[PDB]
Amino acid sequence: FDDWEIPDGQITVGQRIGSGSTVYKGKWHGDVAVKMLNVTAPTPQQLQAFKNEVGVLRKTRHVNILLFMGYSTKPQLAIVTQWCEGSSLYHHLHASETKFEMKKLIDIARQTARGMDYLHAKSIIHRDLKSNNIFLHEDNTVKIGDFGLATEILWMAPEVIRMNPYSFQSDVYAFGIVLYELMTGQLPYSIIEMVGRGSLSPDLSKVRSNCPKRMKRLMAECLKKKRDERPSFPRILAEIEELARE
Amino acid sequence: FDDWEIPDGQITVGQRIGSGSFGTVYKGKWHGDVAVKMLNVTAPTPQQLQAFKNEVGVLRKTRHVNILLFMGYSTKPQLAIVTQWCEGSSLYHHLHASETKFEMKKLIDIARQTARGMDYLHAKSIIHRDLKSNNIFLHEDNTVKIGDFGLATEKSRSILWMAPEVIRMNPYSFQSDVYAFGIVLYELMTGQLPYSNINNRDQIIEMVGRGSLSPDLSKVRSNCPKRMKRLMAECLKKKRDERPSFPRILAEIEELAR
Ligand SMILES: CCCS(=O)(=O)Nc1ccc(F)c(C(=O)c2c[nH]c3ncc(-c4ccc(OC)cc4)cc23)c1F
Ligand SMILES: CCCS(=O)(=O)Nc1ccc(F)c(C(=O)c2c[nH]c3ncc(-c4ccc(OC)cc4)cc23)c1F
Ligand SMILES: C[N+](C)(C)C
Ligand SMILES: C[N+](C)(C)C
C-alpha cells in the first residue's frame, strides 16, 4: 500500500489519451500512463476494495503485462503504469490501418497469450480483454492492460451475454476474438440476441488466406460456444509456440 | 541537396499519424525519433524532382525554435520530408479533441511562440498558406513548432482559417497568413472553432467570402486580455490591407504579455 502510493505532488498529469475501464499520459521519474478511476473522496469501503486490488497488482510482473508503478487517492483514485509509445493494437489495426506481415501477427498473438497465461496462473481473470487493452511498447513488446480491479460486446462470450458468468474460459474466447482481429484485420459482425443463443458466431471464412492452418484452428477452438470446449491458456500458448516454429 | 538526402536504408517509417498539408505523416526513426511526411509522389519526373529540390533548398536554410527543424528529404521510393518529432501532438488535438484546458498564461504563451514562428517565416520570404491549429505542434520541451510551411512555391505554381479574399478568388499573401493566425487566436481564446453551429460548407464560403459573416468575437473568454482580443480583431479584418504585419503582431503580444 503506502510504499506504492504516488502522492499527487510527485506526478504531472499530461495529455488525455482516452477511455478504458480515463487515461492520461504523464510524468513520474519518466513517462507514464495514469488511469483516473471515477472516484473522488472515496468512502472507507471503496478505499479498502481499492487497496485490495492494488494489493494484487503490486505482485504482478511480466514482460507482457503493463508494469504497475503505483496508485494515487487524492484528488482522485488512480493507477499509474509504464508508458507504451506504440499506442494500442486496436488503433494499429482499425485506425492507422498498419499492415503487419504475418510473422508479426503471429508474434503479437503469442505475446498476448504469454501475458494471459501469466495472469491466469496468477488467478487473475481479465474479463475485458480486447485489442484496445493491448498496447505496443517502444521495445516492440506487447503489454496487456485493464486487468486491474478484478474483484470489482464484440469480444463477449455467449454465456457472458446470456447470463458468474465470467470465467477463465470467457477470457479465452475474448482472445479468440483478438485472433480474429489479427487474421482478418477486421472486427467481427462489422446481435446480443443472436450471439448469446449460439446461432451467430464470427465469420471464420473471412480470415487471411496465408493464416497458418494451426492458427485458424486454434482461433476456432478459442471461439467455441460451450466454454468447456475451449482450451486453457497453457495449451493455447504451447500450441502457438509450436506452430510459430513450424 | 545531396547532403540532406536521407536514403530509405537510413529511416524506419513507423506508425501513421495523419494527413497534413501535401502528404501523409508517420512517426519514424533516424538517429532518434523523427516525423516523416510522405508526399503524394513516386517516380518523380525531372520537373517534379527539380521543384522538390528547390523547396528542400529553402527548408535547409530555415532555422527557428518555433518552426519544425528540417532534417532532410528522400526521393525514393517516394518523395518525403523528415523533421524533428513533437511528442505533444498538435494544438488542434489539444484544444478540440483531448479538450486540454490551458491556463490563460499558456494560451498567451502559445500565441506568442506562434507569432515568433510566423514572424520568422515572413522575414524569410516564406508564405505559409496553410497555418492552422492542426499544424501547430507542441514539443516535449514545451516549445511550439509551426509546420506545413514547406513547399511554398509549389503550392504557388481549412476553409475556417481562410481569409475572405482567399475564398472569393492566387490571392494568398502575407496578410492572409495574418488572418489565419487570427483564427488560431480565436481558437485559443474561445477553445472552439468558428462557425461551429454551421453544418454546411458552401454556406460559410459564400457568406464569409462576401464579408457579411465573420468569426463571433462575443464568444471569447472573460479572462482574455483586451489587447489580445483587439489584436485578434485587427488580424481578422476583412480587408487584407488593414491587417497588421507579424512584426507588429509579435511586438503587440510581447508587450501585452509583460
Ligand atoms: C497494471 C495495469 C493496471 S490496469 O489493469 O488497470 N491497466 C491500466 C492502468 C493505467 C493505464 F493508464 C492503462 C492504459 O490504458 C495505458 C498504460 N500505458 C499505456 N500506454 C499507451 C497507451 C495508449 C496511447 C495511445 C492510444 O491511442 C488512442 C491508445 C493507447 C495506453 C496505456 C491501463 F491499461
Ligand atoms: C521543416 C518543416 C517542413 S513541412 O512544411 O513540410 N512540415 C512538416 C513536414 C513533415 C512532418 F511530419 C510534419 C508534421 O506533421 C510533424 C512534424 N513533427 C511532428 N510531430 C508530431 C506530430 C503529431 C503527433 C500526433 C498527433 O496526434 C493526432 C498529431 C500530430 C506531427 C508532426 C510537418 F509539419
Ligand atoms: C512488483 N512489480 C514492480 C513487478 C509490479
Ligand atoms: C540547418 N537546419 C535548417 C536544418 C537547421
Q: Which residue from A180, A83, A99, A194 is spatially nearest to A141, judged by alpha carbons?
A: A83
The answer to whether B22 is annotated as binding is yes
Give B10-18's long-range contacts (Cβ < 8 A, gap of 24+). B11/B36, B11/B74, B11/B82, B13/B38, B15/A86, B15/A87, B15/A92, B15/A96, B15/A98, B16/A96, B16/A97, B16/A98, B17/A96
Is B16 in contact with A98 (Cβ distance < 8 A)?
yes
CA–CA distances in Å: residue A203 to residues A222, B50, B62: 14, 51, 54
Burial pattern A108-135, b for ≥16 Cβ within 10 A else e, equals bbbbbbbbbbbbbeeebbbbbbbbbbbb
State which residue of chain B sits closest to A26, comparing Cα positions. B88
From the number of C-beta atoms within 10 Å of its C-beta (0-12, 13-18, 19+), residue A160 rates as: buried
Three cell numbers written together for A167: 470465467
Other Cβ atoms closer than 10 A to B95:
23
Question: Counting Cβ atoms within 10 Å, is residue B96 exposed (0-12), middle (13-18) or buried (19+)?
Answer: middle
A117 is catalytic: no
Residue B12 pairs in a beta bridge with B29
Residues of B taking part in catalysis: 130
- Pick the atom of ligand 3 nearest to A59's CA: 1
Rounded Cα gap, residues B139 and B145, in angstroms = 7
B18/B89 Cα distance (integer angstroms): 11
- Rounded CA-CA distance B8/A232 in Å is 44
Domain ranges, ordered by start, for chain B: 1-87, 88-258
Question: What approach was used to elucidate this structure?
Answer: X-ray
**What is the Cα–Cα distance from A153 to A161, expressed in whole angstroms?**
8
Superfamily holding B1-87? Phosphorylase Kinase; domain 1 (3.30.200.20)
| C-alpha grid cell, residue B216 | 463571433
* Nearest ligand, measured from the Cα of A66: 1
The one-letter amino acid code at A226 reads K
Q: Do B245 and B254 touch, CB atoms closer than 8 A?
A: no
Whether ligand 4 lies within 6 angstroms of the CB of B70 is answered as yes
Total number of residues shown for chain B: 258
Amino acid at B132: K
Distance B30 CA to ligand 2 centre (A): 15
Residues 6+ apart with CB under 8 A from A41: none
Q: Which residues of A touch B106 (CB under 8 A)?
A: none
The radius of gyration computed from the CA coordinates of chain A, to the nearest angstrom, equals: 18
Show the cell assigned to B210: 462576401
Q: Which residues pair with B28 in a beta bridge?
A: B13, B34
Q: How many Cβ contacts (< 8 angstroms) between chains A and B?
A: 18
CA–CA gap between residue B61 and residue B53 (Å, rounded) = 13
Q: Which of B3, B64, B69, B146 to mutate for ligand 4's pocket (most ligand atoms within 8 Å of CB)?
A: B69
Q: Which residues have C-beta within 8 Å of that of residue A70, sequence separation ≥ 6? A: A4, A5, A6, A28, A79, A80
Q: Whose CA is nearest to atom 1 of ligand 1?
A: A68
Q: Which of B86, B121, B126 to mutate to test the pocket of ligand 2 (most atoms within 8 A of CB)?
A: B86
CB distance A182 to A202 below 8 Å: no
Of A15, A66, A126, A146, best ligand 1 pocket probe by most atoms within 8 Å of the beta carbon = A66
Report CA torsion sign: B97, B98, B99, B102: negative
Q: Do A16 and B89 touch (CB under 8 A)?
A: no
Q: Among B219, B190, B195, which residue's Cα sits nearest to residue B207?
A: B195
Residue A21 is assigned to a ligand binding site: yes
Q: Return d(Cα A79, Cα B257) in angstroms, integer.
A: 38
CA angle (B124 as vertex; B123, B128 as ends), nearest 5:
95
CA distance A236 to chain B (A): 29
Spatial CA neighbour of A64 closest among A82, A90, A91 = A82
Backbone angles phi, psi at B217, to 5 degrees: -70, -20
Query: Between A15, A17, A87, which is nearest B15 by CB?
Result: A87
Window B:1-30, CB contacts with A under 8 Å: 15-17
Handedness of CA A194, A198, A203, A207 (dihedral sign): positive
Q: Do B15 and A97 touch (CB under 8 A)?
A: no
Q: How many CA atoms lie within 13 A of A217 on its CB side?
A: 6
Instruction: Give how far A191 is from chain B: nearest CA, Å.
Output: 31
Strand partners, B5: B73
Look at ligand 1, atom 23, and give the residue with the nearest C-alpha: A87
- Answer for the pair B49, B40: CB distance below 8 angstroms, yes or no: no
Which residue among B15, B98, B100 sits closest to A98, beta carbon to beta carbon? B15
- The type of residue at B76 is K
CATH 1.10.10.10 is right for the domain spanning A1-85: no
Distance CA B183, CA B206 (A): 18
B88-258 — its CATH code? 1.10.510.10
Atom of ligand 1 nearest to the CA of A18: 28
Query: Contacts of residue A96 in chain B, CB cutoff 8 Å?
Result: 15-17
- Reference B17, options A92, A132, A34; nearest CA is A92
Whether B100 and chain A come into contact, CB under 8 Å, resolves to: yes
CA angle B115, B116, B119 (to 5 degrees): 80
- A13 contacts A24 by C-beta, under 8 angstroms: yes
Q: Which residues contact B227 (CB under 8 A, 6 or more apart)?
A: B252, B255, B256
Which residue is catalytic, options A3, A8, A31, A128? A128
Where do breaks (C to N over 2.5 Å) occur in chain A, by preceding residue number? 21, 152, 163, 190
Q: In A43-58, which positions are buried (b, 16+ CB within 10 angstroms) versus exposed (e)?
A: eeeeeeebbebbebbe
Neighbouring C-alpha atoms within 13 Å toward the C-beta of A220:
12
DSSP, residue by residue, chain A: -GGGB--GGG-EEEEEEE----EEEEESSSEEEEEE-S-SS--HHHHHHHHHHHHHHTT---TTBPPEEEEE-SSS-EEEEE--TT-BHHHHHHTS-----HHHHHHHHHHHHHHHHHHHHTT---S--SGGGEEEPTTS-EEE-----TT--TT--HHHH------HHHHHHHHHHHHHHHHHSS-TT--HHHHHTTS----GGGS-TTS-HHHHHHHHHHT-SSGGGSPPHHHHHHHHHHHHH-
Q: Is the peptide bond before B225 cis (omega within 30 degrees of 0)?
A: no
- Is-contact B182 B232, C-beta < 8 A? yes
Those residues whose C-beta lies under 8 Å from the C-beta of residue B21, and which sit 6 or more positions away, are: B130, B135, B147, B148, B150
DSSP chain B: -GGGB--GGG-EEEEEEEE-SSEEEEEEESSSEEEEEEES-SS--HHHHHHHHHHHHHHTT---TTBPPEEEEE-SSS-EEEEE--TT-BHHIIIIIS-----HHHHHHHHHHHHHHHHHHHHTT---S--SGGGEEE-TTS-EEE-----HHHHH--GGG--HHHHT-----HHHHHHHHHHHHHHHHHSS-TTTT---HHHHHHHHHHTS----GGGS-SSS-HHHHHHHHHHT-SSGGGSPPHHHHHHHHHHHH-
Give A219's Cβ-side CA count (13 Å radius). Answer: 26
CA neighbor of A39 nearest in space, from A12, A63, A75: A75
Please tell me the total number of residues recorded for chain A in this structure.
246
- Report cis status (omega within 30 of 0) of the bond before A165: yes
B161 CA: distance to closest CA in chain A (Å): 25
Please provide the CATH number assigned to the domain covering A86-246.
1.10.510.10
A149, A24 in Cβ contact below 8 A?
A: no
Contact between A95 and A142 under an 8 Å Cβ cutoff? The reply is: no
How many whole angstroms separate alpha carbon B67 and alpha carbon B152?
A: 15
Contacts 24+ apart (CB under 8 A), A183-190: A183/A105, A183/A207, A183/A208, A183/A211, A183/A215, A183/A216, A183/A219, A184/A208, A185/A93, A185/A99, A186/A94, A187/A94, A187/A154, A188/A154, A189/A154
Which grid cell is B52?
522538390
Q: Is B42 exposed, middle or buried (0-12, 13-18, 19+ CB in 10 A)?
A: exposed
At A223, which amino acid appears?
A: L
C-alpha cell of B203? 454556406
Residues A34 and A78: their CA atoms lie apart, in Å, by 7
Distance from the CA of B61 to the center of ligand 4, in angstroms? 6
Q: Does B98 sit within 8 Å of A16, measured CB to CB?
A: yes
- Cα–Cα distance between B50 and B85 in angstroms, integer? 27
* Residues 6+ away with beta carbon under 8 Å from B16: A96, A97, A98, B24, B25, B26
Q: Which residues of B touch A98 (CB under 8 A)?
A: 15-16
